[PDB]
Amino acid sequence: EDPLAYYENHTSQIEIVRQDRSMEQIVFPVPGICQFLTEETKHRLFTTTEQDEQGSKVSDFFDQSSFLHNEMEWQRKLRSMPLIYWFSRRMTLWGSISFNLAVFINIIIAFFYPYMSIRPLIVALILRSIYYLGIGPTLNILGALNLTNKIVFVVSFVGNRGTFIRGYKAMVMDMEFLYHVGYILTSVLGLFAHELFYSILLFDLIYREETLFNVIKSVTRNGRSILLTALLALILVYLFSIVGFLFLKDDFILEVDRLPDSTERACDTLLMCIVTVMNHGLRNGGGVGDILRKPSKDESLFPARVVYDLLFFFIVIIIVLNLIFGVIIDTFADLRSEKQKKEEILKTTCFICGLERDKFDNKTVSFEEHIKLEHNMWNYLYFIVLVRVKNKTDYTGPESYVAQMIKNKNLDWFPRMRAMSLVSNEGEGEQNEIRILQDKLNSTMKLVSHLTAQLNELKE
Amino acid sequence: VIKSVTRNGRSILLTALLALILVYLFSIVGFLFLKDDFILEVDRLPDSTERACDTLLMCIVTVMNHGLRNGGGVGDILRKPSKDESLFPARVVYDLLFFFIVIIIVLNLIFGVIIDTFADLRSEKQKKEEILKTTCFICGLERDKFDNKTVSFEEHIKLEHNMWN
Amino acid sequence: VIIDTFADLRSEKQKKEEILKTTCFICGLERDKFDNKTVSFEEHIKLEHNMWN
Amino acid sequence: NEIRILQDKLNSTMKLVSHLTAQLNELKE
Numbered sequence: 140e141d142p143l144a145y146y147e148n149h150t151s152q153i154e155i156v157r158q159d160r161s162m163e164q165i166v167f168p169v170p171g172i173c174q175f176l177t178e179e180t181k182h183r184l185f186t187t188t189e190q191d192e193q194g195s196k197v198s199d200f201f202d203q204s205s206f207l208h209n210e211m212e213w214q215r216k217l218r219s220m221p222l223i224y225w226f227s228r229r230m231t232l233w234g235s236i237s238f239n240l241a242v243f244i245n246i247i248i249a250f251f252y253p254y255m256s257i258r259p260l261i262v263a264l265i266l267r268s269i270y271y272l273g274i275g276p277t278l279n280i281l282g283a284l285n286l287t288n289k290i291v292f293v294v295s296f297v298g299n300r301g302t303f304i305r306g307y308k309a310m311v312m313d314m315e316f317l318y319h320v321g322y323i324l325t326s327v328l329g330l331f332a333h334e335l336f337y338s339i340l341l342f343d344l345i346y347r348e349e350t351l352f353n354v355i356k357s358v359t360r361n362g363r364s365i366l367l368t369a370l371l372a373l374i375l376v377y378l379f380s381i382v383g384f385l386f387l388k389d390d391f392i393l394e395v396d397r398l399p400d401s402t403e404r405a406c407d408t409l410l411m412c413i414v415t416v417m418n419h420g421l422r423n424g425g426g427v428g429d430i431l432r433k434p435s436k437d438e439s440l441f442p443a444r445v446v447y448d449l450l451f452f453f454i455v456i457i458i459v460l461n462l463i464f465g466v467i468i469d470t471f472a473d474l475r476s477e478k479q480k481k482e483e484i485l486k487t488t489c490f491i492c493g494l495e496r497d498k499f500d501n502k503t504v505s506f507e508e509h510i511k512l513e514h515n516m517w518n519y520l521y522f523i524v525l526v527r528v529k530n531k532t533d534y535t536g537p538e539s540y541v542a543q544m545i546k547n548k549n550l551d552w553f554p555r556m557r558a559m560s561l562v563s564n565e566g567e568g569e570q571n572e573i574r575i576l577q578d579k580l581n582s583t584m585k586l587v588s589h590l591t592a593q594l595n596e597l598k599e
Numbered sequence: 600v601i602k603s604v605t606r607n608g609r610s611i612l613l614t615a616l617l618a619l620i621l622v623y624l625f626s627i628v629g630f631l632f633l634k635d636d637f638i639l640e641v642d643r644l645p646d647s648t649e650r651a652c653d654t655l656l657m658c659i660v661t662v663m664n665h666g667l668r669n670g671g672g673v674g675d676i677l678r679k680p681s682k683d684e685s686l687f688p689a690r691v692v693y694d695l696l697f698f699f700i701v702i703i704i705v706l707n708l709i710f711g712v713i714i715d716t717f718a719d720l721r722s723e724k725q726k727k728e729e730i731l732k733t734t735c736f737i738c739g740l741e742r743d744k745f746d747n748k749t750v751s752f753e754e755h756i757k758l759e760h761n762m763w764n
Numbered sequence: 765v766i767i768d769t770f771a772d773l774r775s776e777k778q779k780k781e782e783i784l785k786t787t788c789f790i791c792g793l794e795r796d797k798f799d800n801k802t803v804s805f806e807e808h809i810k811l812e813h814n815m816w817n
Numbered sequence: 818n819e820i821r822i823l824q825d826k827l828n829s830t831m832k833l834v835s836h837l838t839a840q841l842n843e844l845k846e
């Protein structure tokens with residue numbers, strides 16, 4: 140409607156650094172393709188970027204610029220097809236439907252197996268179907284619905300993500316696609332192979348919830364340390380089993396129950412001793428001594444038995460076992476620290492230049508205004524898209540220089556720790572003051588020269 | 600102390616649900632294979648044993664109660680197999696897996712989350728106290744700036760930049 | 765005590781790694797100083813202030 | 818205040834230079 144509003148919408152301003160190292164401002168019309176970028180992809184890129192050793196995220200953004208352009212092209216192509224776009228828009232809804240159906244099937248299986256908001260309405264309908272037809276028919280209907288809904292969800296996922304644009308090898312490489320395929324296979328097995336298979340779909344909950352995923356990460360982040368601690372515990376149990384087999388063989392007596400003798404020697408063979416220890420002592424709070432025969436005070440070896448039990452309890456159980464829990468707690472602390480650091484850097488520094496918010500205070504332009512307008516990353520992405528799109532013959536001075544920089548694989552044109560508004564105004568003021576001082580000095584020198592000329596003329 | 604738990608209650612509940620899912624899978628495995636060994640002694644008010652795994656739901660309930668309440672795990676209540684039994688190695692493997700996954704790792708996640716919540720609360724309290732007691736409420740200026748100057752930071756807040764003024 | 769020892773070891777390792785990878789070995793100058801200058805910090809350590817030299 | 822003192826000194830120097838130039842012009846005339 141308003142020409143000025145339309146032109147302002149399509150106009151983007153950026154700050155760049157030339158070879159001379161003097162900052163410059165480029166105002167350009169945003170390419171039409173750039174508008175097609177989805178905001179979900181923008182948020183994912185903003186939150187996913189990882190700073191390099193230099194402390195700048197610009198390299199990853201530049202690398203992902205090409206993928207973003209391809210995503211824009213694929214989004215336009217998808218817009219060309221209303222039905223595929225509509226399916227893509229509802230991918231989350233399909234995923235939720237599939238998860239809810241799997242949960243309902245699992246609940247029914249758990250409640251009645253073996254056999255033979257709208258969510259309350261769905262539950263009532265499921266109960267009515269169970270009563271009218273039975274558990275078998277209702278489970279079959281729910282399984283078929285879940286399989287079809289998950290297939291639709293996967294179709295929408297592949298359509299929306301555009302991962303096929305990367306290539307079929309990329310499709311196979313994407314872990315999420317393989318996980319969805321595995322979910323579909325599990326649903327298929329549940330529908331036909333056996334109902335209990337649907338229980339596996341419960342693991343999908345981990346993918347759905349992020350807090351549970353973080354709790355699991357707390358363990359899997361340092362899984363190698365936990366496994367090594369378990370191996371050390373196994374080695375200690377092996378040594379202790381050797382000691383018991385050599386010396387305490389008799390005391391290894393375990394009560395036994397036989398299906399249609401009440402005790403057995405569970406340490407006849409050193410391997411059997413190791414197995415018995417590794418099972419009972421690890422499962423026993425006191426240790427191996429809990430299951431081993433209780434020695435009387437009269438027994439000569441009773442002090443040795445007490446020493447052995449105390450050593451086992453203090454080493455294998457008290458210390459070694461607690462190492463896994465300590466490692467898990469330390470992993471929790473490390474994850475919390477990393478998350479806090481990442482959030483602070485993201486929300487308190489400029490993405491492009493890395494400048495802190497503290498610098499922009501007490502100045503004409505605030506930090507928020509700086510990021511919103513002066514140093515918007517998407518403006519730089521749009522400039523890159525324009526440079527690629529624009530013909531070389533039509534390249535403007537700064538545009539030609541930036542295209543040459545892109546060809547040279549150099550990111551110097553990206554500003555680093557430099558902002559126009561923060562330093563340029565003060566520098567201009569200082570330069571004006573210095574120029575005034577220089578003009579005064581030049582006037583004084585001219586007056587001195589005139590006086591010298593007058594003196595020379597008088598002498599002559 | 601209560602906040603330390605309620606602050607991240609969602610994570611604790613999700614960990615409990617994950618433990619329930621693991622117990623459900625393990626109950627499925629036992630019902631399919633280890634159905635016989637699920638024998639529990641019973642006391643009757645005025646048989647001394649019962650099969651607590653006749654139905655998969657009953658197996659799930661029995662595991663979720665006894666194994667979670669048992670330090671060793673489900674294997675503590677399950678019938679003890681003799682070395683002669685063919686399935687004894689399978690029973691030992693099942694018990695070890697249960698103890699190492701459901702009890703050793705998954706259960707400790709709740710305690711780790713509680714400890715991490717304690718640490719987060721302590722850090723937040725320290726940051727808030729430091730900001731309150733070392734910076735100006737109105738202008739946010741630090742106390743370090745006002746030292747070596749005519750007007751001290753305390754005088755600045757008391758008179759120059761009093762919020763109530 | 766074991767948990768506190770874990771935390772202390774993690775803190776010491778983080779501090780040592782940060783100092784090693786963000787400061788000059790010879791002069792101790794931080795990487796932040798060399799930015800916005802003709803010679804970068806990495807170039808400084810590689811050529812200007814190489815310990816092996 | 819320091820900058821104002823410096824500016825006053827510069828203005829006095831400029832006034833002296835202008836007076837010298839005027840005297841030279843008068844002598845030439």
Ligand SMILES: Nc1ncnc2c1ncn2[C@@H]1O[C@H](COP(=O)(O)OP(=O)(O)OP(=O)(O)O)[C@@H](O)[C@H]1O
Pocket residue numbers: 181185488489490491510511514515516517
């Ligand atoms: N260089 C940057 N540093 C930090 N945050 C940035 C930077 N560039 C953009 N952001 C933030 O990323 C998000 C993307 O901003 P964007 O300009 O896309 O906003 P928008 O409201 O979708 O756009 P518009 O209203 O101008 O059509 C916003 O939170 C913006 O503050």
Ligand SMILES: Nc1ncnc2c1ncn2[C@@H]1O[C@H](COP(=O)(O)OP(=O)(O)OP(=O)(O)O)[C@@H](O)[C@H]1O
Pocket residue numbers: 734735736737756757760761762763
């Ligand atoms: N801007 C500020 N920044 C930090 N602390 C402040 C600020 N303004 C007030 N305070 C503190 O808040 C409390 C309120 O101070 P206030 O002037 O009300 O003191 P008062 O002793 O009750 O008053 P009075 O003695 O002047 O009648 C004091 O601790 C004061 O130091």
Ligand SMILES: Nc1ncnc2c1ncn2[C@@H]1O[C@H](COP(=O)(O)OP(=O)(O)OP(=O)(O)O)[C@@H](O)[C@H]1O
Pocket residue numbers: 787788789790809810813814815816
């Ligand atoms: N003063 C220093 N501060 C920090 N790191 C340094 C310093 N001097 C050297 N390094 C690093 O220590 C390692 C040793 O560098 P060195 O010069 O030996 O490299 P090189 O590749 O083996 O040698 P060249 O390629 O020159 O034959 C490199 O990582 C270098 O960056």
Ligand SMILES: [Zn+2]
Pocket residue numbers: 489490491492493494509510514558
């Ligand atoms: Zn910036």
Ligand SMILES: [Zn+2]
Pocket residue numbers: 735736737738739740755756760
């Ligand atoms: Zn103040």
Ligand SMILES: [Zn+2]
Pocket residue numbers: 788789790791792793808809813
């Ligand atoms: Zn150096």
